[PDB]
Design a protein around this ligand. Sequence first.
Ligand SMILES: COc1cc(C(=O)N2[C@H]3Cc4ccccc4[C@@H]2CNC3=O)cc(OC)c1O
Length: 130
Amino acid sequence: SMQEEDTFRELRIFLRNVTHRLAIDKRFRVFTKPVDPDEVPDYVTVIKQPMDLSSVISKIDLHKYLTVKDYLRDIDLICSNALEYNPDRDPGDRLIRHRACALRDTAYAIIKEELDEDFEQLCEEIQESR
Ligand SMILES: COc1cc(C(=O)N2[C@H]3Cc4ccccc4[C@@H]2CNC3=O)cc(OC)c1O
């Protein structure tokens, strides 16, 4: 229905705003665009599902997220991809893992403080009915 389309449009607006706040945070710069294979050649072969904040914006706009849970699965993927690709003890790997974890923690914390749980519940119920 049109009321259901209004619900998903509100969800999209909410998701774009959270994503924008992550994207402008200096710590999360390396997650703003896809990992370039010319700068990191083995990435696309090791990481099966690359994910970054620009691709998240693209997926919001294509109506790929019908719930906050679906969006958070992609935020989790930005984090898990960095934990998997950079697992070493060296400072370079530890810094990207800490930034990855901080990106995930920030997204969850924004959603915990600003998302009405009845709004998410409505999205899930419209999703389950389709
Ligand atoms: C997100 O995961 C990674 C990111 C980088 C990294 O420093 N990047 C990546 C992505 C990117 C995107 C926007 C701006 C800067 C950057 C820098 C430079 N070029 C890149 O391709 C390195 C990683 O491992 C060596 C790695 O797992």
